[PDB]
Design a protein around this ligand. Structure first.
Ligand SMILES: C[n+]1cn([C@@H]2O[C@H](COP(=O)(O)OP(=O)(O)OP(=O)(O)OC[C@H]3O[C@@H](n4cnc5c(=O)[nH]c(N)nc54)[C@H](O)[C@@H]3O)[C@@H](O)[C@H]2O)c2nc(N)[nH]c(=O)c21
Ligand SMILES: [Zn+2]
Ligand SMILES: [Zn+2]
Lengths: 124, 293
């Protein structure tokens, strides 16, 4: 609804959009909606980010750009390369955190050597 | 019901060969909606069913496949159809999408503005169009052939489409073009495909499979749209997404279709046969360059 444009406009009034969004949702703010949930044969590997959907039975796959705060808010990405890590790819998200796909990716990091979500797949 | 498990319905030659006047389209289930599986965008189910039918066509699937996607912005700021294209196409395929207003998309290139502003320097392999002009809803007089974005799409087919390439262009009862129907006669095969997810709409995807650059079938465009409406008025189609229940074979087959550069004089029966089978593309193999003009 108009609440997406509200929180998306809010992260335009801050120097730290990640913490801005996370503080907003943690205080009861309405999670960002309209993320592009894909339909997948839940027989994937389970890695965090993949070129094709890789959801397990405990996962859901989203279009990468739709779950990236910097893509959705049309603000500059923080990556040193300037390339978004999600855009053009697919992002797997635990089924329990589907209520807020954007805040989950802002709250977690894939394992460097392992590529699975630390705490949600990584076994190193 | 077997048809409920298919991705949709394709216009049969039974209605292609009819000769009737253009009549009003009256669907018994018109405007009825089907709940989407898993709260997912309706454009997810529609694009996937379109891709599932194209899985049964002789699509040319080369390396570095060039796909352009018009009308990709929907559902207020996103592009679910482009993401489905990313799920469907080979990982090395190039996706260029475009719509009038701003949106976020998983395409390689995203261009905002009128489709005329999309300058295609080379030739592409697959054209998907979900464009629809809102003024088409202002039904006043008789249902005449429309120009609008179809003039741009017709010129694209004649100039910027590889031999062996294919198109999928959305039409409705009132959003249609005589010239585009007649261009389907320059492909090896053609049909109109209506997804089961949106069977309650007169919407259909005009498919031209394997472009040949020469007239293979002489088509009366106005008479063929009347046949399309006659088919919709004669064919019960129930809303369904059963085809999406098993996605084990959804991805486009990695065909490795070769891309060849040939002069028009060198095109013979073997080349035409290979183009018609989805086994060959004829275009440049430069680096794709599509910008805003
Ligand atoms: C088929 N039909 C038409 N009318 C009458 O003819 C008018 C023009 O139709 P028109 O050609 O839009 O086609 P339809 O409304 O299907 O398109 P439908 O809306 O599905 O549109 C198909 C596609 O249009 C796309 N689209 C429509 N609106 C917009 C828009 O505003 N912007 C963009 N970008 N796309 C749009 C939309 O996404 C959808 O998938 C209708 O509005 C009725 O007055 C019918 N009346 C009755 N009683 N029963 C019918 O079966 C019937
Ligand atoms: Zn991004
Ligand atoms: Zn790990």
């Amino acid at each position: 609804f108009a609440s997406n444009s509200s929180v998306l406009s809010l992260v335009n009034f801050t120097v730290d959009p990640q913490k801005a969004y996370l503080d907003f949702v943690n205080a009861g703010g309405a999670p960002l909606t309209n993320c592009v949930k894909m339909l997948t044969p839940k027989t994937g590997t389970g890695i965090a980010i993949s070129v094709k959907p890789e959801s397990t039975a405990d996962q859901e796959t989203y279009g990468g750009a739709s779950v990236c705060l910097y893509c959705r808010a049309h603000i500059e990405h923080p990556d040193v390369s300037g390339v978004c890590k999600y855009k053009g790819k697919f992002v797997q998200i635990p089924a329990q955190c589907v209520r807020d796909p954007v805040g989950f990716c802002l709250s977690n990091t894939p394992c460097n050597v392992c590529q699975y979500w630390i705490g949600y797949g990584c076994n190193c | 019901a077997s048809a409920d498990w298919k991705p949709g319905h394709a216009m049969p030659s039974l209605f292609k060969v009819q000769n009737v006047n253009l009549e009003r389209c009256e669907l018994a289930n018109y405007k009825q909606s089907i709940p989407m599986p898993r709260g997912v965008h309706m454009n997810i189910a529609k694009y996937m069913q379109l891709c599932q039918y194209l899985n049964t066509c002789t699509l040319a699937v080369p390396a570095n496949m060039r796909v352009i996607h018009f009308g990709a912005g929907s559902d207020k700021g996103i592009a679910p159809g482009t993401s489905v294209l990313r799920q469907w196409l080979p990982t090395d395929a190039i996706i260029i999408d475009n719509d009038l207003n701003e949106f976020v998309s998983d395409a390689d290139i995203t261009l905002f503005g009128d489709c005329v502003t999309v300058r295609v320097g080379q030739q592409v392999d697959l054209v998907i169009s979900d464009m629809y002009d809102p003024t088409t809803k202002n039904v006043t007089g008789s249902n005449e052939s429309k120009a609008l974005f179809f003039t741009y799409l017709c010129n694209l087919i004649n100039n910027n489409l590889a031999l062996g390439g294919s198109v999928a262009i959305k039409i409705t009862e009132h959003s249609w073009s005589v010239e585009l129907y007649e261009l389907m006669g320059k492909f090896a095969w053609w049909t109109v495909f209506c997804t089961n997810a949106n069977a309650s709409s007169s919407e259909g995807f005009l498919l031209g499979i394997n472009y040949l650059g020469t007239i293979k079938e002489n088509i009366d465009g106005g008479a063929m749209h009347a046949n399309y409406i006659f088919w919709r008025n004669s064919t019960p189609m129930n809303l369904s997404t059963y085809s999406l229940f098993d996605l084990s074979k959804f991805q486009l087959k990695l065909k490795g279709t070769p891309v060849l550069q040939l002069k028009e004089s060198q095109i013979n029966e073997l080349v035409i046969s290979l183009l018609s089978q989805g086994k060959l593309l004829i275009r440049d193999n430069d680096t794709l360059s599509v910008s805003t003009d």
